[PDB]
Structure formats: structure tokens, C-alpha cells
Amino acid sequence: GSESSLALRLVNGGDRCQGRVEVLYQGSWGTVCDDSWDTNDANVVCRQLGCGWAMSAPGNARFGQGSGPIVLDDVRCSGHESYLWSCPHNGWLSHNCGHSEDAGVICSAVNI
Amino acid sequence: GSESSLALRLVNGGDRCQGRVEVLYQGSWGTVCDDSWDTNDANVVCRQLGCGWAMSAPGNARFGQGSGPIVLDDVRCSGHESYLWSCPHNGWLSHNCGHSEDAGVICSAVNI
Ligand SMILES: [Cl-]
Ligand SMILES: [Cl-]
Ligand SMILES: [Mg+2]
Ligand SMILES: [Mg+2]
Ligand SMILES: [Mg+2]
Ligand SMILES: [Mg+2]
Ligand SMILES: [Mg+2]
Ligand SMILES: [Mg+2]
């Protein structure tokens, strides 16, 4: 429901441990823009989901465009954070992007 | 010289950012036992050396056996420490190991 935020999932990757990053924001699953999105950020996501370490951090909607709101932009994780929510970013819903820039991750546990 | 301790290096990894962990102790480069050695401990070493975050924390002398003293055992970093010296351990030179257990790290900055 609309009171709930701060869940994380990967979609459209064909595997539990890769795909487009989606973040729950006020009942809607939103996406993350690829601006400043890098393997440090992907590693927080991969570790948070128990998927190993980040092998790469694809941009440009490699795993498709989402249909929800764009909720995070210019994420600046160091790679050591325990939650994506802990990393610096632009502020929720503050972006300069479109869904052709939706960010993704490929984690080391893919396929296995 | 023999008065100096508390420097950190990785050796025998083929890259600056992976290898056997070695710790300077009274002028000699010593090793770390793999007992309780995990990715939280590796994360502290990797960040201390400017090598990023930890991919894994290999035990059992993956990067060979050292020849110096075994100086640290049962290291229990939380992951947040800025120095390996901050982490809980068994006490300097207090170990129940041999060099076939020398600990190593593999950090994200390994590159080709
Ligand atoms: Cl993991
Ligand atoms: Cl070691
Ligand atoms: Mg972009
Ligand atoms: Mg970033
Ligand atoms: Mg932007
Ligand atoms: Mg052991
Ligand atoms: Mg430990
Ligand atoms: Mg021991």
C-alpha cells in the first residue's frame, strides 16, 4: 500500500541476481537513473539482496524500461553500505532523466 | 627498522589489490591466520589500501605461505573500521595456526 517504501528488487534479468533495479516508494515500484550509477552502487544492491558482489552496473535500460516513477538519481555509494537507502543521492524523486536511462546490476551469483 | 609496526601490504596476488595479507610487526612482515577471516575483515583491508571493497576473503594460503611470524588470529572486524588495527582479535602473536592458513583478500580494484 501507499504508506510503504524501502523494498528492493531486480526485474527482467532472467535470473535472481541481475536485472533492472526497482525500489518501492509509497506503494509503487520505481526505477533508478543511470547517471553516476557504477559498480560501487551496484555492489550495495548485490550485497543487500544476497547476490554476491557486483560484476557490472549496466545503464541505458539494458534490462528494459520501467513504467513506475523515477525515484533515485546520481547515487554515490562507496560500495560498503548495508542498504541502498544509506547512500548519498539527489533526494527522492529528484531526477533529470527518462526511463531510457533505467539502471541495472549484474551480480557475481548470476547463473551459478 | 625493528621499532616500526602497523603497515599493511598485499603480496603474491599478481595485482596491487589482491593477495596474501601482511602486517608489519617490529620490523618484520607477518601474516594473518584464516580463522574467523571473512569478507568484513577483507573489506577493512581493501578500503585501508585504497583498493575498493571486498569481493572475497580467501583462506588456506591461496596466495601462498608467508615466511614471517603469524601476528594476528581470529580477526572480528565489523566492516566499519578505518584500520585493521581497530578490529577485535586474539592479541598480537596469539594464534593456533600455521602458514598453510595464511589469509588473503580479493578487492574490487583488481583490474586488467
Ligand atoms: Cl552476498
Ligand atoms: Cl596472511
Ligand atoms: Mg544517463
Ligand atoms: Mg555512483
Ligand atoms: Mg541525473
Ligand atoms: Mg583455519
Ligand atoms: Mg572475521
Ligand atoms: Mg585461531
Numbering used by the authors:
A (entry chain B), B (entry chain A): 986 to 1097
What wording appears in the published article?
We therefore proceeded to address the ligand-binding potential of the SRCR domains by adding Ca2+, Mg2+, and a cocktail of sugars to SRCR8 crystals before freezing. This yielded a second crystal form of SRCR8 with the original Mg2+ ion, site 1, and two additional cations bound, sites 2 and 3. All three sites are class three cation-binding sites, with the coordination obtained from residues in distant parts of the sequence. Analysis of the bond lengths and coordination numbers suggest that site 2 is a canonical Mg2+ site, with octahedral geometry and average bond lengths of 2.1 Å, while site 3 displays a higher coordination number and longer bond lengths, more consistent with a Ca2+-binding site. The Mg2+ at site 1 is coordinated by the backbone carbonyl groups of S1021 and V1060, as well as the side chains of D1023 and D1026, and two waters, and is buried in the domain fold. The Mg2+ at site 2 is coordinated by D1019, D1020, and E1086 plus three waters. The Mg2+ at site 3 is coordinated by the side chains of D1020, D1058, D1059, and N1081, with additional contributions from a water and an extra density. Attempts to model this extra density as any of the sugars or alcohols present in the crystallisation solution failed to produce a satisfactory fit; therefore, it likely represents a superposition of a number of molecules. In contrast to the Mg2+ at site 1, these cations at sites 2 and 3 are exposed on the surface of the domain, and the protein only contributes a fraction of the coordination sphere, with the remainder contributed by waters or small molecules from the crystallisation solution. Thus, the surface-exposed cations likely provide a mechanism for ligand binding for the SALSA SRCR domains, whereby the anions of the ligand substitute for the waters or the density at site 3 observed in our structure.
